[PDB]
Amino acid sequence: EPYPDDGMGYGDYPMLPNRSQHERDPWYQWDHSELRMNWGEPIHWDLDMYIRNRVDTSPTPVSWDVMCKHLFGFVAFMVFMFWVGHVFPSYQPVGPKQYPYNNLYLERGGDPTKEPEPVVHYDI
Amino acid sequence: MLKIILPSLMLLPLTWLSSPKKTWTNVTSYSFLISLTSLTLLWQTDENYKNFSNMFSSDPLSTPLIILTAWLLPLMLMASQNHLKKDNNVLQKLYISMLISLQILLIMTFSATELIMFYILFEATLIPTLIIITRWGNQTERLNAGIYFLFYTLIGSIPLLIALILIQNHVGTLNLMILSFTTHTLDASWSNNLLWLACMMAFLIKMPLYGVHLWLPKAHVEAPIAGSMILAAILLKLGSYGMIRISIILDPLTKYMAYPFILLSLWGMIMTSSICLRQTDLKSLIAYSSVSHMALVIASIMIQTPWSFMGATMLMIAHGLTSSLLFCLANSNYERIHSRTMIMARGLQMVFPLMATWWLMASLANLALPPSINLMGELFITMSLFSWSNFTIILMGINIIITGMYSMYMIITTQRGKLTNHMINLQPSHTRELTLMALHMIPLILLTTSPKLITGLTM
Amino acid sequence: PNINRFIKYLTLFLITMLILTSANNMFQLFIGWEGVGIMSFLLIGWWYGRTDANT
Amino acid sequence: SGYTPDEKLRLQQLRELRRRWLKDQELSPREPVLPLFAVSHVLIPMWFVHYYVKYHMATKPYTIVSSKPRIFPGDTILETGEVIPPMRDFPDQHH
Amino acid sequence: YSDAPPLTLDGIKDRVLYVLKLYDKIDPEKLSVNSHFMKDLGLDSLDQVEIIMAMEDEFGFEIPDIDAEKLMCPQEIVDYIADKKDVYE
Amino acid sequence: HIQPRYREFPQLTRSQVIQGEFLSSLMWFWILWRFWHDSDAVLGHFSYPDPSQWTDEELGIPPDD
Amino acid sequence: MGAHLTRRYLWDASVEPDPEKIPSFPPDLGFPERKERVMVATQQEMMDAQLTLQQRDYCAHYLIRLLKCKRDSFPNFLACKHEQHDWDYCEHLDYVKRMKEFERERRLLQRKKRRALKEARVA
Amino acid sequence: GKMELPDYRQWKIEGTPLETVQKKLAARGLRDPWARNEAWRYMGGFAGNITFPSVILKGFKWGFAAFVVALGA
Amino acid sequence: AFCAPPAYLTHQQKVLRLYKRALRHLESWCIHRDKYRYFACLMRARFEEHKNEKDMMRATQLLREAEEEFWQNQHPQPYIFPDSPGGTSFERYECYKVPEWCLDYWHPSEKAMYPDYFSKREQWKKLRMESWDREVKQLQEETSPDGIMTEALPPARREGDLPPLWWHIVTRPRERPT
Amino acid sequence: SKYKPAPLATLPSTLDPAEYDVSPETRRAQVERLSIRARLKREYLLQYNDPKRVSHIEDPALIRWTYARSANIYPNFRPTPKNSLLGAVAGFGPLIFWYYVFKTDRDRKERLIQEGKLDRKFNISY
Amino acid sequence: MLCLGALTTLFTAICALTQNDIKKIIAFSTSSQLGLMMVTLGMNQPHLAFLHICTHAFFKAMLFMCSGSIIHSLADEQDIRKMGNITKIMPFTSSCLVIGSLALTGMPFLTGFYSKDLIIEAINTCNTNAWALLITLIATSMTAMYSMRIIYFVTMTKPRFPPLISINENDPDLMNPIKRLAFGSIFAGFVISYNIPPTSIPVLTMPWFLKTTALIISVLGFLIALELNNLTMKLSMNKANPYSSFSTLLGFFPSIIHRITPMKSLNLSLKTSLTL
Numbered sequence A: 001e002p003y004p005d006d007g008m009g010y011g012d013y014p015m016l017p018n019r020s021q022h023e024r025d026p027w028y029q030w031d032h033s034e035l036r037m038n039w040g041e042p043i044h045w046d047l048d049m050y051i052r053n054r055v056d057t058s059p060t061p062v063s064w065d066v067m068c069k070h071l072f073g074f075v076a077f078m079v080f081m082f083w084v085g086h087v088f089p090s091y092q093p094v095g096p097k098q099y100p101y102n103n104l105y106l107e108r109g110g111d112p113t114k115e116p117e118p119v120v121h122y123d124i
Numbered sequence B: 001m002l003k004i005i006l007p008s009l010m011l012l013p014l015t016w017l018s019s020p021k022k023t024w025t026n027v028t029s030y031s032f033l034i035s036l037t038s039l040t041l042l043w044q045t046d047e048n049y050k051n052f053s054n055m056f057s058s059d060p061l062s063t064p065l066i067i068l069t070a071w072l073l074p075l076m077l078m079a080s081q082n083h084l085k086k087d088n089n090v091l092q093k094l095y096i097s098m099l100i101s102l103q104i105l106l107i108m109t110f111s112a113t114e115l116i117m118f119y120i121l122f123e124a125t126l127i128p129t130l131i132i133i134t135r136w137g138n139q140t141e142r143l144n145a146g147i148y149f150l151f152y153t154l155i156g157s158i159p160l161l162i163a164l165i166l167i168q169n170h171v172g173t174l175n176l177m178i179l180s181f182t183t184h185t186l187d188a189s190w191s192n193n194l195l196w197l198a199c200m201m202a203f204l205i206k207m208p209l210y211g212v213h214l215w216l217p218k219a220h221v222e223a224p225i226a227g228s229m230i231l232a233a234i235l236l237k238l239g240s241y242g243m244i245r246i247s248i249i250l251d252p253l254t255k256y257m258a259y260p261f262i263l264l265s266l267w268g269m270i271m272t273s274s275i276c277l278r279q280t281d282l283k284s285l286i287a288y289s290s291v292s293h294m295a296l297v298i299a300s301i302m303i304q305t306p307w308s309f310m311g312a313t314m315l316m317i318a319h320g321l322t323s324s325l326l327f328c329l330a331n332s333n334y335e336r337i338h339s340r341t342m343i344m345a346r347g348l349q350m351v352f353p354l355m356a357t358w359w360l361m362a363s364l365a366n367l368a369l370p371p372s373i374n375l376m377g378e379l380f381i382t383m384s385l386f387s388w389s390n391f392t393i394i395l396m397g398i399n400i401i402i403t404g405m406y407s408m409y410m411i412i413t414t415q416r417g418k419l420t421n422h423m424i425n426l427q428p429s430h431t432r433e434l435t436l437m438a439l440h441m442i443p444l445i446l447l448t449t450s451p452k453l454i455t456g457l458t459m
Numbered sequence C: 001p002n003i004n005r006f007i008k009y010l011t012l013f014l015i016t017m018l019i020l021t022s023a024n025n026m027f028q029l030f031i032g033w034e035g036v037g038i039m040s041f042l043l044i045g046w047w048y049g050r051t052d053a054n055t
Numbered sequence D: 001s002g003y004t005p006d007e008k009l010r011l012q013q014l015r016e017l018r019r020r021w022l023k024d025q026e027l028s029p030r031e032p033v034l035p036l037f038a039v040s041h042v043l044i045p046m047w048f049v050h051y052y053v054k055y056h057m058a059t060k061p062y063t064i065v066s067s068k069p070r071i072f073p074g075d076t077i078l079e080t081g082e083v084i085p086p087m088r089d090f091p092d093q094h095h
Numbered sequence E: 001y002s003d004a005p006p007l008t009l010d011g012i013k014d015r016v017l018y019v020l021k022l023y024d025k026i027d028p029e030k031l032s033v034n035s036h037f038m039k040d041l042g043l044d045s046l047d048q049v050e051i052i053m054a055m056e057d058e059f060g061f062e063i064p065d066i067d068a069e070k071l072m073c074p075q076e077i078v079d080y081i082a083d084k085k086d087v088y089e
Numbered sequence F: 001h002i003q004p005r006y007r008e009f010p011q012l013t014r015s016q017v018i019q020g021e022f023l024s025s026l027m028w029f030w031i032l033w034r035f036w037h038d039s040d041a042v043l044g045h046f047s048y049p050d051p052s053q054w055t056d057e058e059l060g061i062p063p064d065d
Numbered sequence G: 001m002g003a004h005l006t007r008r009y010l011w012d013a014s015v016e017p018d019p020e021k022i023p024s025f026p027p028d029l030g031f032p033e034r035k036e037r038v039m040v041a042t043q044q045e046m047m048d049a050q051l052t053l054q055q056r057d058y059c060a061h062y063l064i065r066l067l068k069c070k071r072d073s074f075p076n077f078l079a080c081k082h083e084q085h086d087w088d089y090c091e092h093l094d095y096v097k098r099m100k101e102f103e104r105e106r107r108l109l110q111r112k113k114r115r116a117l118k119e120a121r122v123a
Numbered sequence H: 001g002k003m004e005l006p007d008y009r010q011w012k013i014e015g016t017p018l019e020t021v022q023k024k025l026a027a028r029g030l031r032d033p034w035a036r037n038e039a040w041r042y043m044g045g046f047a048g049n050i051t052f053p054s055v056i057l058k059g060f061k062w063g064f065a066a067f068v069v070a071l072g073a
Numbered sequence I: 001a002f003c004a005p006p007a008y009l010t011h012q013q014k015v016l017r018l019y020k021r022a023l024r025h026l027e028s029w030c031i032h033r034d035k036y037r038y039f040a041c042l043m044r045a046r047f048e049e050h051k052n053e054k055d056m057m058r059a060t061q062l063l064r065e066a067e068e069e070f071w072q073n074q075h076p077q078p079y080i081f082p083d084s085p086g087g088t089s090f091e092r093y094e095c096y097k098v099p100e101w102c103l104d105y106w107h108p109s110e111k112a113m114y115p116d117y118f119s120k121r122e123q124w125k126k127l128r129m130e131s132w133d134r135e136v137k138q139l140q141e142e143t144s145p146d147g148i149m150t151e152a153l154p155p156a157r158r159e160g161d162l163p164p165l166w167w168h169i170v171t172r173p174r175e176r177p178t
Numbered sequence J: 001s002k003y004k005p006a007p008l009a010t011l012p013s014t015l016d017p018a019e020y021d022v023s024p025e026t027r028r029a030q031v032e033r034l035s036i037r038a039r040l041k042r043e044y045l046l047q048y049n050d051p052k053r054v055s056h057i058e059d060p061a062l063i064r065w066t067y068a069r070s071a072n073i074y075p076n077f078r079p080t081p082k083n084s085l086l087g088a089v090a091g092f093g094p095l096i097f098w099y100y101v102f103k104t105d106r107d108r109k110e111r112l113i114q115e116g117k118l119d120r121k122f123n124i125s126y
Numbered sequence K: 001m002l003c004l005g006a007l008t009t010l011f012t013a014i015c016a017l018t019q020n021d022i023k024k025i026i027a028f029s030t031s032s033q034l035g036l037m038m039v040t041l042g043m044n045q046p047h048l049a050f051l052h053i054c055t056h057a058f059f060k061a062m063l064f065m066c067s068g069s070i071i072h073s074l075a076d077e078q079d080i081r082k083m084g085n086i087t088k089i090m091p092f093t094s095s096c097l098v099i100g101s102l103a104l105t106g107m108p109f110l111t112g113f114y115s116k117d118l119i120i121e122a123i124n125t126c127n128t129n130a131w132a133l134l135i136t137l138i139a140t141s142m143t144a145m146y147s148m149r150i151i152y153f154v155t156m157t158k159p160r161f162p163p164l165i166s167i168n169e170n171d172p173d174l175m176n177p178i179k180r181l182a183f184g185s186i187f188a189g190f191v192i193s194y195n196i197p198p199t200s201i202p203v204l205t206m207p208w209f210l211k212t213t214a215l216i217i218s219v220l221g222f223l224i225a226l227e228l229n230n231l232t233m234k235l236s237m238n239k240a241n242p243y244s245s246f247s248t249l250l251g252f253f254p255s256i257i258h259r260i261t262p263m264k265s266l267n268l269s270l271k272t273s274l275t276l
């Protein structure tokens, strides 16, 4: 069944089923073992992509749609829940930590010459 | 610089006068020493460029190449001793001489003060190359490939001829030294905007740009191994050397007249890198690898920042050595396999243990593994490109991911997997094949120890 | 049949890993970062014949 | 099903030959005809390294730099001779 | 050492014999190599599937479908297993 | 020379059992020894204050009005 | 995790503090001449003991002690144990403070809600 | 050494969990034919049930014995 | 792997090859053994009934609803043996299965040692060339009248003749090269 | 849930109606196709197992593939729509996209440098 | 990274619960522990993150080589399904495996305990995503679950391995290193924590349920899983939940993002960029 005549070059090259070498019977003694292709059988146009070390088209126990929806659903729910989180964070009943001097103004590398507005912390 | 050249010329008398049986060793042994004399130019204990004489000069940019041009003639003559060992004893001495003239001409072109000396010698190199590709080319299509290699370069060449004669009238001498120390500032007219394109286009063509690179895949495919080594290692870099010395003039326009090429090259880098991903002919994949890794160079010789330039100088010398190494090992598979197809010949490490180590190191040079000059080069072009526009990392970032994929795929489907059942049994590796490789990589290891020598004019 | 090569790559991995650990300038950190990546490629697919290891 | 009577003989016979091939693969006696150190690579490498670290690195500027040593309150500085003042007394003893 | 001792045919031979002697339907005192399953011992088209599967689990490998639609004789199993495992005795 | 066993409990070497009990018993000696010497796995050793028993004087809660 | 969050997120947050602004009210509010914190260590002592900026807390002083007894007593890493309790305590006695401050700010905010309504006398 | 193999007869389903599976299968009328093959799993040596505390607590007896002694000294 | 693939599949081999996938995909769900051996003799029951259906149409309607019941009640990670396609050791040792036509390019020094090995190898290569003629002729004289042609190859059928196209089923690289 | 083959995750052999077919015509093909394969198989198997052979088994089915894919393309090119519209969006589309991505950035950068905002601190290289 | 570290922790842990390959389960645990390591870096606690890296190395290395011992001793069986009762057949590795398993589950006074609970309570005390805080803790219970899955299926169950038995772990080269790392797994957390420089100013003051949360969640994680393992033995068909397969085939990220990207990235080169 020649590839459709739309003038993109395929020519007379057969339009062989788009199935990857992955599901070619893995036990049969394929002449070319690793391409799971026999000698003489028409090679597929994109056998450079269906090779085993590349893409696969091997039936999956779960339907593809079911997969795409489920995966992304999970992703979304998670991303969302993480957002519910940022909205409502978890923080202990503890006030802010208190650093000495002027919040270590000079040591945080502050300018020695210009003194900072004193930030004082009182007991209790 | 007439020791790197006169002794070279004398090689021609030796290839002809010498015995048919001893012709190969006299020529290869002597040019190895010719390379040793070439190493003297590296002795620059000061910044001043070394103006040997009126017509012949060598500055940091040319010196790293003249040595490579002299170095590959030995190797080219060692990689073509097999094919070309079936010839009539006068076809050989022609091939050997053709290879000899290429570096005589290329040594002079890279070591030329007058820009039109570059042009005459620049476009002469096509004669020796076209003969090597067409006369000894294995495939039916080399007549075609030769035509493509002659016309794309020639149509670009005549505009440069008009441009350089034009500047001589405008300034009064095509001497690279003076042109540099003289005020040639183009005036952003519509015409100048054409001059700039005239000068750069001929160089941009033999440095395959995305728009005009179809000549290189076709040429290296049917070219004999020696021609493919010369085209990838020295011939394409002739275009880069030209762009570095010609943009000294046309200083103002490239600030805004480069965008077209820069974008052509960076998008080109991605597409050329990607089609390598599914190309059945190994020589085809290396050639497009060469287009992409050379598309980075035209995008650094145009941004024009100090780092770009020496990123370029680092990568050009490095990629030159790596590409040949890849083209040389591709040939060794081609001669035993007898087909260029990548899919056949799977599992070779199982049968050719060492060639596979050379294949692995060549691929790691091909992709950017870090203690290699290849990476330093890309890291630098990448930096400047980022400076030009932070967004550039995206496109120079899709290329790095693709470059890793095709480089390893060449190793994974050629040198791993189950062995091919019974192709014509693959005779073991000759010591010549392995040395021809060792001679490519041992210098790649040594240069990576001291990158300063191939850093370019800028640094 | 190739125990010695396997041990050889394991120590090369350790050398790249430690270089990655103790690297002041990041260029050396890069040498380690890429370096363990390549030897992992060589060592994950030790048994090259198996396509699964290659994938 | 069951093997075809003419396939249980092409497996009959070819198995018989495989058994002989594997016997032939067996190597005859003689088949392969061939025609503290610890200190060694810990001490010898060491001398060299030291030679390198104490006479190149050490000598060159800013090649081996070290975080300042730690000095606490009440501990003496060997080089200058000063004794770091003891700190202000900790008032609380609450555990 | 860690790898077990290589199978010797006269062993593999006994092992396949043994397992069958533990299948209740197959008489333990008649199972005789060369005693075809469906013609002599009386097993059914569906038993064979299992008899093979037991063997695939006694020797730890899979007898492919097409090559196992024929493990009839209780011996074919003993040379096929051995041929697949390279036992030249 | 360990002998492969068919449908029987592999015979075990003296050393296999002793080394195995050894490593496990030291694990338990260490867990017990540290638990006794340093039982700060639970409570740390600092008690959480009840934030809801701080006299309004303690926190500066002015007398309403 | 905790109830405090439930108060703020569930129900109403009007009277629940915002962690980003814990001393939201006047610092002196509630205290005549409240005493400010005091640091035993010296801006230099710390700088000479190379204490990480973060570790320069009001317990920096008991830390320096620990670190002293950890350099001294080197081969023995299990003997500077009293020093660690002390540091930790100092810090527990700081975490508690940071908790007392949070509770005080909570209650004070409530004062506002109470007072507003009280002060919001009908007429 | 021409490894021998335990007598096939040795294996029997009674006394193992296969027997209870055997009896309920018999209630349905099924005969559970290959159950005898799966007997050595439960037959001997490996017959004892393994409890999760037993693994987590392996060696605890001496471990505590060791602890007490050390604590004493 | 050894025998050749039949052109079309019968009804039986399709049913009897489900009994394998099914029971083997029931031992991934029933990780234990007594549970399995139980839940499986219950499987046979399912296949045991509907064994004597003579109504093909029906039979191919029980089969087509069996393999859909199965597809939706299969385990995602089936227990596939270690050395079988899709396994964990599949083609692991293939990096050591060199193809044996490579010992022909060995240096006379290498083959100098290992002497008796090559004395027997040269015998076998004499066997191979000594019969290619009688073999190919056999392969041809026995080409059944043009028509259906299967990949099955003939046995020997005469003394001295070596069962044909045999050089690569015998002389196969050993499985575990180790 | 019925398995739903997508261009990927295709319909398995089982669950495929065609598999369940005995119409004598179908069986006819299924037995005709083995013949082509058996024929081709017995044309590979007594030419690869041939003593006295050194030449390269060619696998012409692979040579028909490469020729079809790199030297039988332009002789079968006819410029239609859906081919030239799609043959210009691919070559000039992104090439024009990035130009307004790089021009706008380079112009933003230049303006900022000109007005004096870009910090360019500790940048002593380029 | 606190957020993505958190997602990987549970995502990888949930996938590990149903994986039936012993090496695969340990590898997912490698990712889950690093997910916890990513979380501490995300909560800006660098020093403790490094502490877990060192402790993580000792026990994960042990469990892998422990399974290396089981896989090599058995006829290269890499599936928990066919491997059982290693505790009586091979006590030396089983002892090493449970030592490693408890370290992975943060058993009190073992190397995981010194660094891991510091990280847990750090979370329970900092200001963080609520979703991240909840997932990290159940991720900890799952670590106990899959840890439970390995020992129940691999060690405490009737044997299901192929009938001929040839097990030897006597080789010094097996024991010695396994023995040496076991000593490290038992004592390393003790040594590293005391010796390192005081850093991070931890918060040891917590309500007791947060102080002991890591311990309890780990305990019930195993408790719930043990209930599960026990459940299976019955002659009643449970199979698995609809989201169980979702778990077993790795969340379906492999099935979908590995078939689409490599397919729509290569199709565009051959069909569009190369030929067109």
Ligand SMILES: CCCCCCCCCCCCCCCCCC(=O)OC[C@H](COP(=O)(O)OCCN)OC(=O)CCCCCCCCCCCCCCCCC
Binding pocket: B391, B394, B398, J100, J101, J102, J103, J104, J105, J106, J108
């Ligand atoms: C594949 C990895 C992709 C990773 C993407 C990472 C994106 C990071 C954020 C980039 C976009 C925001 C940059 C913000 C910088 C500060 C704000 C700013 O002023 O942008 C700089 C400049 C102007 O952008 P803007 O403000 O949008 O003004 C547009 C006016 N028409 O910016 C501009 O010059 C204009 C364009 C801005 C947006 C450019 C979007 C680039 C898209 C890249 C696609 C990559 C894939 C392409 C296909 C590959 C496969 C074939």
